[PDB]
Amino acid sequence: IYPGTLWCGHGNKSSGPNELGRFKHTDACCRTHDMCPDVMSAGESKHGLTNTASHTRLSCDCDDKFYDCLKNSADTISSYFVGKMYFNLIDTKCYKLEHPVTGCGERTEGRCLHYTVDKSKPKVYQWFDLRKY
Amino acid sequence: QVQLVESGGGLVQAGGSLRLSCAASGRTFSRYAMGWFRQAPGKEREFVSAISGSGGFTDYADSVKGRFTISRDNAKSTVYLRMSSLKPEDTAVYYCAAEGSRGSSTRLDARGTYDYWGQGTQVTVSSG
Ligand SMILES: *[C@@H]1O[C@H](CO)[C@@H](O)[C@H](O)[C@H]1NC(C)=O
């Protein structure tokens, strides 16, 4: 957990859900990210997918909104470190509903940044790598 | 704030060659993929081409594979769509689009991948 923040990271310090840490902007982003409706706990199964991580994995919509929230924040240095630790180190994935992937378009470092699909079959929930910060 | 502006277009005879150029401004250019979308009168604005930030992966729509070429100049922050051997049913409005900021990986085969769009220029193939 970050010095001066309540919500950013596993576990939490806060007493009420309305309470925010030192930084008005970064802690709001982390609070919104930690209140994602659809998550998957460690070892939880949902939507035909099983996550095999000790940390909870979240939906790609929450991660995209969290990315935009951190990139548009006013306090640059705290949001910078939170983004560079969450998105770029742990090598997590996000799950969303998409046509079945046929192959990876562009793979840079250990992650696929553009993928390709078959438009012929229906949509299914699948894992996708997270963009870097 | 960002600004995407096109150049090129108009009427050209069947078989002729034309390239549209699209200049972006406001942010870093090389990070974000960019693409070109084709809207015929009375149809969904479908994508015709897209190119990644690095340039190493491009995706073309099946209707136009092998006739169009896509490229970018990161120093001038521009993207070029070259077109050759134009055929009927290809006259349309061509829009220039840029990949928005995303936390997850996205496909270039979707409208929802691109946030910033230009006004686009008309392309007309008249003969046969
Ligand atoms: C975080 O706080 C909320 C309410 O403030 C609480 O429901 C939740 O259990 C807390 N997290 C942990 C790990 O205790």
Bound ligand species: 2-acetamido-2-deoxy-beta-D-glucopyranose
Number of domains of chain B: 1
DSSP helical segment count of chain B:
0
Report the portion of residues of chain B in β strands.
Answer: over 45%
The percent of residues in helical segments of chain A reads 25-40%
CATH-assigned fold name of chain B: Immunoglobulin-like
Number of helices of chain A: 3
Overall 3D shape of chain B? globular
Largest sheet of chain B: 7 strands, mixed
Helical content class of chain B: under 10%
Q: For the record, what is the CATH homologous superfamily label of chain B?
A: Immunoglobulins
Rg of chain B computed from alpha carbons, rounded to a whole number of angstroms: 14 Å
CATH architecture field of chain A: Up-down Bundle
**Which class of secondary structure composition applies to the elements of chain A?**
alpha+beta
Total strand segments of chain B? 11
If classified by CATH, what would the architecture of chain B be? Sandwich
Strand order of the largest sheet of chain A: 1-4
What oligomeric arrangement do these chains adopt?
heterodimer
- Whole-number tally of structural domains of chain A: 1
GO molecular function, one term (chain A): calcium ion binding
Binding site for Ca(2+) (chain A): 7, 9, 11, 34
Subcellular location (chain A): Secreted
Disulfide bonds (chain A): 8-30, 29-69, 36-62, 60-94, 104-112
